Amino acid sequence: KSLKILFTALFGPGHLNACLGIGSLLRKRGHQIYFAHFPRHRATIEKHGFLFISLLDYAEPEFPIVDMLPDIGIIAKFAFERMHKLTPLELFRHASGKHTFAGMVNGSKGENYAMMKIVKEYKPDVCLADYLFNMPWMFTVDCPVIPVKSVNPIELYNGPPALTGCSIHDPPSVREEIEQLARKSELELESELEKLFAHFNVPLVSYNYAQQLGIYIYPGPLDYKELGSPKENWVRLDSSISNFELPEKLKDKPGKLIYVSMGSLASAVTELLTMILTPLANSPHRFIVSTGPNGDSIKLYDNMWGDKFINQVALLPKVDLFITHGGSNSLIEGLTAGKPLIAIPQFGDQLDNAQRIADLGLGVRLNLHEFSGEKLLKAIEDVLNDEKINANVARVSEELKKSDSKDKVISLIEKLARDKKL
Numbered sequence: 001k002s003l004k005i006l007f008t009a010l011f012g013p014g015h016l017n018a019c020l021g022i023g024s025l026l027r028k029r030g031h032q033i034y035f036a037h038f039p040r041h042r043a044t045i046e047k048h049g050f051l052f053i054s055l056l057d058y059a060e061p062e063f064p065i066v067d068m069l070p071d072i073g074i075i076a077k078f079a080f081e082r083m084h085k086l087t088p089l090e091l092f093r094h095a096s097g098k099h100t101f102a103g104m105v106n107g108s109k110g111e112n113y114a115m116m117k118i119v120k121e122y123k124p125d126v127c128l129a130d131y132l133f134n135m136p137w138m139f140t141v142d143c144p145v146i147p148v149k150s151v152n153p154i155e156l157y158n159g160p161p162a163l164t165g166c167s168i169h170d171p172p173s174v175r176e177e178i179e180q181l182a183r184k185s186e187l188e189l190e191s192e193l194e195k196l197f198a199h200f201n202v203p204l205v206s207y208n209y210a211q212q213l214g215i216y217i218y219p220g221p222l223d224y225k226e227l228g229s230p231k232e233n234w235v236r237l238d239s240s241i242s243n244f245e246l247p248e249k250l251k252d253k254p255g256k257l258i259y260v261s262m263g264s265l266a267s268a269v270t271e272l273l274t275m276i277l278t279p280l281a282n283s284p285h286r287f288i289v290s291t292g293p294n295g296d297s298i299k300l301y302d303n304m305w306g307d308k309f310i311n312q313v314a315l316l317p318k319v320d321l322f323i324t325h326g327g328s329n330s331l332i333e334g335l336t337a338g339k340p341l342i343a344i345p346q347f348g349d350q351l352d353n354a355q356r357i358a359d360l361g362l363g364v365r366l367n368l369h370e371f372s373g374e375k376l377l378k379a380i381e382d383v384l385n386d387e388k389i390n391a392n393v394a395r396v397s398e399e400l401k402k403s404d405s406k407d408k409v410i411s412l413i414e415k416l417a418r419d420k421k422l
């Protein structure tokens with residue numbers, strides 16, 4: 001029999017790709033797939049055969065949602081300046097109790113009211129939501145609700161705090177301070193969540209509590225098995241996820257083929273791509289560059305080719321290296337295709353992804369704070385001729401191909417939708 005399945009996710013970006021991915025698996029099984037989101041992403045959602053519902057059309061009049069949406073361009077421009085200037089520890093000191101995304105919590109009241117009305121009218125059999133924190137609607141609606149996590153999942157364990165970029169090699173004494181700062185700002189998030197939940201008259205829960213089922217997307221071979229098991233009811237999905245013609249300009253240029261992409265959001269800060277691409281001019285290699293929304297004003301040299309948006313998943317099998325911001329989706333796409341990574345983390349959970357790449361010998365972390373031409377060129381030389389990095393990367397690529405976590409997770413989704421229990 002057929003299920004009505006409702007997806008939602010935060011405004012943006014990055015929280016749709018995993019939802020769209022689970023979405024497709026479920027569509028193939030003959031389920032009616034709804035997606036409550038924003039007009040701005042209606043095309044991507046409808047192109048996957050899903051039914052679009054504008055969150056904005058189900059707003060309560062006091063909370064029209066658009067008033068309270070974050071200026072995530074402003075936050076990213078600010079994040080770049082601070083990440084250029086500051087060590088991780090200085091970043092957490094200069095934040096001064098302010099949490100990476102707790103400012104977004106008070107703002108989410110309108111989204112909560114809309115999801116409340118949308119579930120009530122459309123009566124889904126199950127909801128899935130990719131948020132940075134749990135919302136009260138997820139515990140009031142008359143169907144089961146599955147939190148979907150695409151961020152680095154270190155937050156699902158009783159280990160070092162998320163957002164720190166802690167290495168497994170970092171001795172306790174070295175991380176003590178940054179982790180105190182990280183736990184302090186975690187309590188500002190609990191404190192904001194307490195207010196959001198009290199407003200809706202809903203018993204407070206942890207921001208990443210899963211009542212019945214939670215799905216985190218992360219490769220098994222990167223998952224934090226050294227920290228034991230994730231929080232109650234969280235299940236791992238290893239990955240959610242045409243052709244590519246190589247540019248004429250890079251034909252008959254020396255070296256291997258390197259993809260550069262700092263993601264849609266950090267790329268909008270032109271200074272970021274300019275300080276990466278400037279030294280790569282004299283790197284004896286060919287670069288395809290995702291130049292971002294303001295890519296028109298990015299200087300590309302004779303050894304590079306760029307477009308604002310690239311078919312990343314089609315490109316990746318062809319390259320020998322990926323210079324990434326360390327977003328979870330870029331990491332998994334990269335590893336699926338068996339390509340090593342240079343991670344230059346820009347924000348939040350990317351610090352954890354960057355350090356996971358380096359710790360597991362999948363590539364290198366190169367922070368904006370310690371960044372130089374010479375260091376980027378040497379990292380490129382090192383990762384391209386490190387036989388052990390290639391072997392670890394090939395190992396993850398095979399595991400990601402060989403997964404039945406897709407079948408297991410679909411089944412748990414369907415079972416939960418049907419029985420209202422697992």
Ligand SMILES: O=c1ccn([C@@H]2O[C@H](COP(=O)(O)OP(=O)(O)O[C@H]3O[C@H](CO)[C@@H](O)[C@H](O)[C@H]3O)[C@@H](O)[C@H]2O)c(=O)[nH]1
Nearest residue numbers: 013014015017150151263290309310312327328329330350
């Ligand atoms: O030219 C481009 C640039 C990007 N992409 C796609 O855009 C997505 C990028 O996702 P990701 O690498 O995770 O970057 P963000 O969208 O910035 O990810 C946000 O959300 C993720 C959670 O899913 C977090 O891990 C990140 O830290 C956060 O920045 C991927 O599907 C890419 O294939 C393209 O197809 N072409």
